[PDB]
């Protein structure tokens, strides 16, 4: 149902933003749907706590994968900054979920109709909270 396709890593930027080579054949910046990892680049809030950890996690995950796939939700495919909005998978593992599960991101920016995996992400977030991991420590 959801549109999914292969992509190739260009570079990991931070915990929730990565540059990939789309099936299109064009280099694009992707921002992970439904999550927010702590900031590491913008002068507002600074280098938030867990930022570097979130960044390291994502980098590790995409750099070690055999296969990267991008899955678009049902509504808009790009944000106002021109970033592609998707669920990213590394060897069939959802990075968006992986981060939440570890308490390295919170569920955020839920913009209907792009919320197909919201409940899934929410459950993982509840578990991380319950286990008092990283952000929830
Ligand atoms: C995740 C996501 C973020 N965004 C926008 C909202 C925020 O804009 P503003 O910058 O105007 O606040 C910003 C959050 O991204 P970052 O966490 O990368 O900064 O990107 C969307 O528009 N749609 C989305 O699905
Ligand atoms: Ca962020």
Q: The domain that contains 92 carries what CATH number?
A: 2.40.50.90
3-state SS of the chain?
A: CCCEEEEEEEEECCCCEEEEECCCCCEEEEEECCEECCCCCCCCCCCCCCHHHHHHHHHHHHHCCCCEEEECCCCCCECCCCCEEEEEEECCEEHHHHHHHCCCCEECCCECCECCCHHHHHHHHHHHHHCCCHHHC
86 contact partners, CB below 8 Å, separation of at least 6: 30, 32, 33, 70, 71, 72, 73, 77
Contact 70, 4 (CB under 8 A): yes
Contact 4, 116 (CB under 8 A): no
Nearest in space to 16 (alpha carbons), one of 74, 100, 117, 128: 100
Atom nearest to 80 CA in ligand 1? 22
Nearest in space to 82 (alpha carbons), one of 126, 30, 18: 30
For 113, the domain range is 1-137
Number of domains in the chain: 1
Atom nearest to 17 CA in ligand 1? 18
Which method resolved this structure?
Answer: X-ray
Compute φ and ψ for 119, nearest 5 degrees.
Answer: -65, -40
Known active-site residue 101? no
The one catalytic residue in 83, 97, 101, 125 is 83
Distance CA 35, CA 94 (A): 12
Long-range CB contact pairs, 85-91, < 8 A, 24+: 85/30, 85/31, 85/33, 85/114, 86/30, 86/32, 86/33, 87/2, 87/32, 87/33, 87/117, 88/18, 88/30, 88/32, 88/62, 89/4, 90/61, 90/62, 90/64, 90/65, 91/65, 91/66, 91/67
């Amino acid at each position: 149902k959801l549109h999914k396709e292969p992509a190739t890593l260009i570079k990991a930027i931070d915990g929730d933003t990565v540059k990939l080579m789309s099936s299109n054949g064009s280099p694009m910046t992707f921002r992970l749907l439904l999550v927010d990892t702590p900031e590491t680049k913008h002068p507002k809030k600074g280098v938030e706590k867990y930022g570097p950890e979130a960044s390291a996690f994502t980098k590790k995950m995409v750099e070690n994968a055999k296969k990267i796939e991008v899955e678009f939700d049902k509504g808009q495919r790009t944000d106002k900054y021109g970033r592609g909005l998707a669920y990213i998978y590394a060897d069939g593992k959802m990075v968006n979920e992986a981060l939440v599960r570890q308490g390295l991101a919170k569920v955020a920016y839920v913009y209907k109709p792009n919320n197909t995996h919201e409940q899934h992400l929410r459950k993982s977030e509840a578990q991380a909270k319950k286990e008092k991991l990283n952000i929830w420590s």
